Amino acid sequence: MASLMEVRDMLALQGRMEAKQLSARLQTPQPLIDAMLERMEAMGKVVRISETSEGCLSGSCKSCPEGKAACRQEWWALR
């Protein structure tokens, strides 16, 4: 249906941008996007900025003791 190649080209012509923006405009799951870019850069593209948003756990919000997080999204950026 939709592979990472999409955001790849978009960012290939744009540059510093976030994937969550596109996914949002299409109501596409955000938690997946995190893996979309992560998986894309997993090979060694350029740069990626992962960000999380929640409002339940007060202890785990900024600091990452484990790393895993429920529902997350990152951004794609080049040099």
Side-chain angles (χ1 to χ4, degrees), residues 5-75:
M5 302 186 302
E6 299 301 90
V7 180
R8 173 180 180 180
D9 56 82
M10 301 301 179
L11 278 286
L13 301 165
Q14 297 177 29
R16 290 72 57 176
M17 279 291 184
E18 54 180 70
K20 63 176 299 183
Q21 187 61 269
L22 303 183
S23 61
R25 294 182 59 172
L26 303 181
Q27 303 181 271
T28 302
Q30 299 176 330
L32 183 285
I33 302 298
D34 179 79
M36 190 177 185
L37 287 47
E38 181 177 271
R39 185 173 183 163
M40 179 185 303
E41 179 190 278
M43 69 179 60
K45 273 296 184 299
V46 182
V47 179
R48 68 180 177 81
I49 303 175
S50 60
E51 182 63 90
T52 183
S53 61
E54 63 177 275
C56 180
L57 291 63
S58 62
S60 180
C61 178
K62 182 64 186 304
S63 182
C64 300
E66 180 181 272
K68 187 185 184 184
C71 303
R72 59 169 166 175
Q73 55 198 332
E74 63 185 64
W75 314 322

